[PDB]
Amino acid sequence: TSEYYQEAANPIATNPALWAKVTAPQISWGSTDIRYKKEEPAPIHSAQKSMNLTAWKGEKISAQLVVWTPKVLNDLTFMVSDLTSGSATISKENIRTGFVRYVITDELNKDGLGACGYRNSADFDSTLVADVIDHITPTLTLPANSTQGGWISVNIPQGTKAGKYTGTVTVKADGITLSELKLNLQVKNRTLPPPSEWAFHLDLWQNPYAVSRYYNVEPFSKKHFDLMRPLMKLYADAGGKVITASIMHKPWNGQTYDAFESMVTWLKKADGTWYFDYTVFDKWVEFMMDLGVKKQISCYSMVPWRLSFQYFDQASNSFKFLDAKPGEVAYEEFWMNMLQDFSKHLKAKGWFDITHIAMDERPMKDMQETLKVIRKADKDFKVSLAGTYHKELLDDLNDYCITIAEKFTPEEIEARRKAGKVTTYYTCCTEPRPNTFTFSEPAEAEWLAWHSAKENLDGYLRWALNSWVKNPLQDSRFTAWAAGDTYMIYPGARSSIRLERLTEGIQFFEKVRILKEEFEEKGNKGAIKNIDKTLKMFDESSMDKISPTTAVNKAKKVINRY
Amino acid sequence: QTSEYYQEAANPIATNPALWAKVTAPQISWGSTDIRYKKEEPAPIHSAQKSMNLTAWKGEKISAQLVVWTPKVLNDLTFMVSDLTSGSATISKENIRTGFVRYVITDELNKDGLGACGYRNSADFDSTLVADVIDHITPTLTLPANSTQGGWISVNIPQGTKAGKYTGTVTVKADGITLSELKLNLQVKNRTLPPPSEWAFHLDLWQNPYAVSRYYNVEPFSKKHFDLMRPLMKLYADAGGKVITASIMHKPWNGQTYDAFESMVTWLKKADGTWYFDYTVFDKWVEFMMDLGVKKQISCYSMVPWRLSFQYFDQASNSFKFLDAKPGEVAYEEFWMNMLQDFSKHLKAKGWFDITHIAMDERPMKDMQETLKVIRKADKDFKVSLAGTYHKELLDDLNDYCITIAEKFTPEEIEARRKAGKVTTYYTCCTEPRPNTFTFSEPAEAEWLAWHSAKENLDGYLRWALNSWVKNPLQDSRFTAWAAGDTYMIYPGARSSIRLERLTEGIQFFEKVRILKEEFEEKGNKGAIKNIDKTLKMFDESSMDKISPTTAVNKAKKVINRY
Ligand SMILES: CC1=N[C@@H]2[C@@H](O)[C@@H](O)[C@@H](CO)O[C@@H]2S1
């Protein structure tokens, strides 16, 4: 109820001429590849009344329906039935419905070659786009001449018996039924493990400070964790493996609407001794582990974007700053002290094996000077970098994440896989496509996971799960970057089109891995070669002969035939 | 001549040898001007049609397509046409243009089939070669094994040709020897169609001179530039073109086309507060088009350019600066009054003021009203035009008003506008799947457009791009926006399109319908007027699904030619 909301005003006026051949309200299955605009009729010639889906046991699969009306429709609703198949059933508890709601977005930089740098919103276009999966609001009133998408997620349980299942989606308005769309689902005799058991390394950096701000509650209070639980569950259920921690004040110098505070207390006592306390850090880590996010903790950062380190100075009873750089003796002395304490603490908690000291796009020289400090503190501290490819760092880094344009050699990837290291890629503001801006094509998000599979990478990294702007449900623009850069989940614990398509891609990554292990076990070199040539579609420079949407849909069909 | 020869793009569709196994020898036949014959398949013709019966008025241009398809390589394919003889009287072969109907890359409507608007990545759509370019320049072509090639034949019938039946021969040669002699019969009736200069039909196809200077890499408005444009724009004059496009400021459409329109007027702000304006480009362009026969109207774009940022040469900084200002602002009014008052004097001095329209493209109501006030304050007699949405409020203020096809003026509104000497037309753009002139549109759609003007008692038709060429217009007609072919209808080398030739035939029939009604009103002929009018009801934009554009057009041609 407190999560109900109003969308922003459409910056595009509705054109009555576009709506003149719409005589009655129209209800049809649509496509999960499409963001239907609010102010235009759905681009669908013909009412498609049936939907054929194919899926594995355990898989989450989705479909979009669409409603558009020349008249006002009050209290629009859709329920879905059980899915029946002779004697066996998929309960409707396993089916989430939501209204695909509209958020303000912009566009790429004026040149079309990137989306990096500061922005005044006045200098760019402004539109509404369908991105939010609103599973909370039970009904909506559609105005005259407007369109509204409906997202339907089907969670197929593990125990479900292989066969063809039939079901009904019932759209109502004003208290009366407008249409019964049919839904067929072919469940195959192959099982997809739960999210907890997926190999895919998904790192989407979390900002707890954005949630405390938006809801105006005290950080790390009961209320704060209660609001974050379903929100972060979305991340766990997409296969999230990495817990973000800020072990010092402002690791990214407040580049986001909400700055990261320190989850560690840095106390310099007046007698030369230090006192460190990890109570916040521990509560945050324990909380995320509880949700199923447990493979890695990434601590930002020893090389924060501004080289100014906050500490509580007891002598003056105040916050002071140490200005110090990697390569300075004072920098080393300051960090050795903390890291040696942090190391003991982490071993006592049983988290040391998984805890990485983490850096974001720092230069070569600084990384080398920083590594020396780290190794001197503890030889077994794990380290991560999301940044530029450097042959010099391949052995020192346990999680190495590289821009999409750059590549590890297959030799380098095998050695890294063999040694239990993690090897991923990212996109950021640089790359017009593929990306997860609110205006990006939905299939782009899915494409990202397939690209991991083509490159034999472990997964994918993006720098902002939920670094919300002021009013994230209404307006996704920020003072920097393309709109949507800073988040992919919304308040109320509402998923995005982007995150659901990414999750589907991740599921197919897992399927590709399971099929290859089976085909290596049998003698099946025909199947391996075929899968591998489907995967060559996911090259960042073959997007102009084969579009992301075409690529994805081709490859889905292929894997689902095996 | 030689510098206009070119290679087509690679076919995105592979040729299938199985489709060609029942083709034993090369085949030559008359075809249809309603059809774009695919390159990679044999012509869909199960019998060689050796004769072609055409009917035409004196003065009329009439066409026919022949088709050649071959299982083997044919070197130096050529076709000449003879004189057409009829007892003692003759139509010289100088009056007959032949061309190879050549292939251009195209796409398709938006995925839904309901429009063709919006930005596009070419990866997201189909890609095919389609027959559109009438190549009258290249004298021969070498056909590869398993391919089809259409040939367009335009017969310009002179005024004063004597009424009767004319016989003639089309001779197709290859490798230096004759493959076939197709026969061509032409029934010339005892009714005469005036030259293009005398057609009532108001055809406005906006011209882009900047595309021609770019593509040939020559200096804009130089001798070479005008020489390349002369035959190119002749195609427009000879289709009945009435309107000269002028850009009186920098980028009136904010570079929506591959080549942006630059300003044909120099806007110099001197450092002492005075302005200097020079119209030398504007004048040379206008004089040049008037010389070709395009003289009824000049349309100057625009006071409401698509981005409200007006360029001027700032002398004080010796640089280009921009004024950001909107209709309804005092600064906007001051900036334009100054220019328009100078422009008005200039236009009167040249004798062009009566025909010069300040022109706008799809702008809102409020902005048009605020802009009109500025215009009227500059000069009360400035004429104004709008291609856009129907608004009752603007009917008196606009001397040329062009409305989307989906919207309609009342017959009362059309009579008042005709009575006052105002012009009243319609357009299609990217919105309308049919009828249109995309490179994939059915050829008859182009002709249907002119008949639709005749059904609605409109003066003519407007389209927004005669020649706003993409990078390689002969090869690939796709653009970063819209259906392929939206941005142009004539090609480099001054080559017509299937689209423009069919549109021209439709325009000719518009003129014939007008002449027959004036005769039938003058006689007592109520039977004929009622019949013509019921033929015309076929050209309704929502009767296309019971009667196809091709069927409509051919039906109506027969009917008019019986009278
Ligand atoms: C791994 C990354 N690190 C940087 C982040 O801190 C943000 O600045 C982001 C903006 O798109 O760009 C890159 S992505």
Ligand SMILES: CC1=N[C@@H]2[C@@H](O)[C@@H](O)[C@@H](CO)O[C@@H]2S1
């Ligand atoms: C009268 C017209 N004006 C507009 C033009 O400037 C182009 O944008 C065109 C694209 O199809 O659409 C409409 S048609």
